[PDB]
Design a protein around this ligand. Structure first.
Ligand SMILES: Nc1ncnc2c1ncn2[C@@H]1O[C@H](CSCC[C@H](N)C(=O)O)[C@@H](O)[C@H]1O
Ligand SMILES: Nc1ncnc2c1ncn2[C@@H]1O[C@H](CSCC[C@H](N)C(=O)O)[C@@H](O)[C@H]1O
Lengths: 259, 259
């Protein structure tokens, strides 16, 4: 069967690539987390297709569901917000295929590729999409105009000590920092802690920003400073951007110099 | 006037977002480096528009050209490969506007935004696109599935010592690394040096890859190891990806684990 991991971009119809539109068009079954599936449903892109979102809350369940359906011979589209390879479905799917002992049967390298196992075969492809970092940057100015680090604050499946390590490294290397999954329930202090770590490498007045629901309804852009981040509140659909030692604000824009 | 910095994505027609297509459609004048402009011309997207590519070799010239035209009241589309905010035109344009003393006249934050000065006004917007990192990752597997660092090896306008610093930090933090502008003429040793720096933090057998002209003609995917990178040759349209201490190869795919 076919299994296409389709990156949706930030969330609006214009945000998808034609390649993503085409992948959805050819899919017989579309799988993804409720919120994303509904966005596509509202766009009117899932008419006449089997839509699967019930019981798709868990990352692993979505991957297993999509893989078993593809192995059975269905043309599946597993949707991800932004890009599937950035804290998305690409990794869970490959890890599951590896676990199931699927082997490449076309002699190729990378993807797309055809794989097969005792339980069938699957043509796997990843359709890229605009990731949150680039999407929120377009709503800020040129914050990522220089070397950037992408870090997820989702301690889920990743030790906080390591995240601290990633933050110190990003801090000492003077990288612009983009925080994915900035705030949680279990640990409502991670954002503040992240800011304090970075504060040891760059000024309090270092430009920072919290962009919520980029390109979606209730989109919100909030400019602040690294120091201000210590008391900031972030949602589940928020991406935080922290400038480097050269970043500065220019007439409302977050400007990170090219040189 | 209008000035839209349009991200083209990797280079093929399906790679553009509908938002990018729409920005080009509404533009009266399209500006960009020869190679990118021609790609769009081949796609048949510039019919009936004033196309500017002669004398557009320099980054600064393209920005100045686009800005002066917009200030004069033209609807301009300044095109960039991938995303305009990743080693693109977003920074040069903002820096030029700042230099010219343009001030925001709509009370907004971030972008899009309207700016004006002694020489006129301009409505500035950045249309995001799939950046090379995400585009080549889709052709590899799930290499960027965890925290990633984007570094440009273009010593142009950026001291090599700093790049070394960025590399050591990325190395010590165990970040997956994506190298933009990997090889030059003046310094045909930067790639090898970069590999040697990272070799002090992760194994020789650490997965690595060189992806050339992703989604374009003569696209090429080459899998190798960090050690192998010391003797690798990269082109101007090549992006290099180096896995972290957990990355591994799986049946032809570059797999960086999610946890
Ligand atoms: N529209 C949007 N606006 C702001 N941040 C967003 C966003 N969509 C996704 N994110 C960010 O991404 C996190 C989910 S992690 C999955 C990310 C996705 N594969 C991508 O490429 O963007 C969120 O917690 C948030 O930090
Ligand atoms: N189609 C493609 N395949 C591989 N690398 C590419 C590419 N297009 C751009 N790049 C990478 O980007 C570098 C130019 S720097 C400009 C990058 C662009 N704004 C973006 O978002 O991708 C190249 O030297 C190369 O490393």
């Amino acid at each position: 069967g076919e299994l296409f991991l389709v990156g949706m971009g930030p969330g609006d119809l214009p945000g998808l690539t034609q390649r993503a539109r085409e992948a959805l068009e050819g899919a017989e079954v579309v799988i993804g987390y409720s919120t994303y599936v509904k966005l596509l449903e509202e766009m009117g892109l899932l008419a006449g297709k089997e839509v699967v979102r019930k019981g798709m809350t868990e990352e692993l369940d979505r991957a297993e569901e999509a893989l078993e359906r593809a192995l059975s011979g269905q043309r599946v589209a597993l949707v991800s917000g932004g890009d599937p390879g950035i804290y998305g479905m690409a990794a869970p799917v490959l890890e599951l295929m590896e676990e199931r002992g699927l082997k490449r049967v076309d002699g190729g390298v990378g993807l797309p590729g055809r794989f097969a196992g005792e339980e069938g075969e699957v043509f796997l492809a990843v359709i890229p999409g605009v990731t949150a970092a680039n999407a929120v940057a377009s709503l800020l100015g040129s914050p990522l105009a220089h070397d950037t680090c992408l870090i997820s604050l989702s301690d889920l499946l990743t030790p906080w000590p390591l995240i601290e390590r990633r933050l110190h490294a990003a801090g000492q290397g003077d990288f612009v920092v983009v925080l994915y999954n900035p705030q949680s329930k279990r640990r409502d202090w991670q954002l503040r802690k992240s800011a304090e770590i970075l504060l040891e490498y760059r000024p309090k007045e270092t430009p920072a920003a919290l962009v919520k629901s980029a390109y979606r309804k209730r989109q919100e852009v909030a400019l602040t400073t690294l120091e201000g981040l210590r008391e900031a509140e972030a949602g589940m659909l928020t991406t935080v951007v922290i400038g480097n030692r050269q970043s500065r604000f220019y007439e409302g824009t977050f400007l990170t110099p090219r040189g």
